[PDB]
Amino acid sequence: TTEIHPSCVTRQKVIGAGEFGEVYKGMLKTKKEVPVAIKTLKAGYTEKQRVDFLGEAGIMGQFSHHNIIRLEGVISKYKPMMIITEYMENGALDKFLREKDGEFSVLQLVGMLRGIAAGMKYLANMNYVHRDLAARNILVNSNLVCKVSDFGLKIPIRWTAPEAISYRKFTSASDVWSFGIVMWEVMTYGERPYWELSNHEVMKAINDGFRLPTPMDCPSAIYQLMMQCWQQERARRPKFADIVSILDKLIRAPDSLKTLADF
Ligand SMILES: Nc1ncnc2c1ncn2[C@@H]1O[C@H](COP(=O)(O)OP(=O)(O)NP(=O)(O)O)[C@@H](O)[C@H]1O
């Protein structure tokens, strides 16, 4: 990753709190000044936190893709240590959608999902199994591009594929199950999967052949595709590259989205 000089960064406002310290909006001067998010490492970090902190930047720095958060660079030689990324104005996806409930077209929602899916196709090609794909780990920018975020060395049962739970077998097909749950998150404008059901109920339903119900006004193709992501046998779930392609068909022929799922 790129080491950058404290002089080029200027923190402006706190916009959040992370595992290792507060996160700020700011300005990077690489000439020309550009908004950035800035993750700080609290003074008083342990060695373990230092390594986990810089490590995420390391993992992130191995990626270059439109729908993957871009590491601008780290600050590891001076204090506050920082991780500098592209600024995403609309913040986390689940929270954004909750604030803008019913305010997007079905095409804007599906395009958000194709962005995510694309990023997950990139990750899956790089052999990177995210393990924690969820709408809260997607960030969104002024133009509504959704980027997979949160790469890092805690994972809730109900975003997780049954085989990944019972045998702890995490693959890219595990992530595809999670992506179906994100689809339901996006199409319900940020509702919590399985509402207030307990982890126990949730696994009993899933193993009993029962799935999350169709979101209100959900296109039939979007609902069926999520049901394709929630097949008990992972080998039958679509791969991310199938998902991207199906969502592109749907976007290219938007009248496909006029027919809704029922019941
Ligand atoms: N690149 C970014 N651009 C814009 N906002 C960001 C960026 N990264 C993080 N944030 C914001 O800062 C918050 C905390 O960042 P992050 O560490 O990535 O999430 P977290 O540790 O899971 N904590 P939280 O999201 O508050 O539950 C997020 O909710 C975002 O609102």
> What residue numbers does the annotated binding site for ATP cover?
15-23, 39
From residue 131, alpha-carbon distances to 58, 81, 174, 232 in Å are 17, 26, 7, 17
Residues of the chain with CATH 1.10.510.10: 88-261
CB 59 less than 6 A from any atom of ligand 1:
no
Name residue, tokens 């068909």: 249
Q: Is 71 helix (H, G, I), strand (E, B) or coil?
A: strand
Name the β-bridge partners of 34.
Answer: 28
Catalytic positions are 132
Establish whether residue 83 lines the binding site of ligand 1, counting it when its CB lies within 6 angstroms of any ligand atom: no
Q: Is the CB of 38 under 6 A from ligand 1?
A: no
Distance 115 CA to ligand 1 centre (A): 19
Cα distance between residue 51 and residue 47, in whole Å: 6
Q: Which residue type does 132 have?
A: D
Resolution in A: 2.3
Distance CA 240, CA 17 (A): 31
Instruction: Give the whole-angstrom CA distance, residue 159 versus residue 214.
Output: 16
- Is the Cβ–Cβ distance between 91 and 99 less than 8 Å? no
Residue 200: CB atoms within 10 Å: 9
170, two tokens: 């995490």
Q: List 11's β-bridge partners, or say none.
A: 26
Sequence-distant (6+) residues with CB within 8 A of 101 are 189, 190
Q: Could you tell me what percentage of the chain is helix, strand and coil, using 3-state DSSP and rounding each to the nearest 5?
A: 40, 20, 40
Nearest to 117, CA basis, from 231, 213, 250: 250
Start-end of CATH 3.30.200.20 domains in the chain: 1-87
Distance between CA atoms of residues 35 and 58, nearest Å: 21
C-alpha of 193 from chain center: 15
CB proximity list for 34: less than 8 A, separation 6 or greater = 27, 28, 87
Burial class (CB in 10 A: 0-12, 13-18, 19+), 227: middle
3-state SS assignment for residue 155: coil
One-letter identity of residue 236: R
Q: How far apart are CA 85 and CA 163, in angstroms?
A: 34
Closest CA to 230 of 261, 208, 246, 206: 206
3-class state of residue 66 by DSSP: coil
Q: What burial letters (b/e) apply to 83-101, b meaning 16+ CB within 10 Å?
A: bbbbbbebebbbebbeeee
First to last CA, the chain: 50
Residue 40 in contact with ligand 1 by CB distance below 6 A = no
Q: How far is the CA of 247 from the centre of ligand 1 (A)?
A: 27
> What CATH fold (topology level) applies to the domain 1-87?
Phosphorylase Kinase; domain 1 (3.30.200)
Technique employed here was X-ray
Residue nearest (by alpha carbon) to ligand 1 atom 19: 18
| 259 contacts 220 by C-beta, under 8 angstroms | yes
Is there a contact between 157 and 206 (Cβ–Cβ < 8 Å)? no
User: In the CATH hierarchy, which fold is given to the domain comprising 88-261?
Assistant: Transferase(Phosphotransferase); domain 1 (1.10.510)
Burial class (CB in 10 A: 0-12, 13-18, 19+), 67: buried
Q: Which of 67, 74, 33 is nearest to 53 (CA)?
A: 74
Report the C-alpha gap between 20 and 241 in whole angstroms: 34
> What is the Cα–Cα distance from 187 to 135, expressed in whole angstroms?
11
**SS3 at position 113:** helix
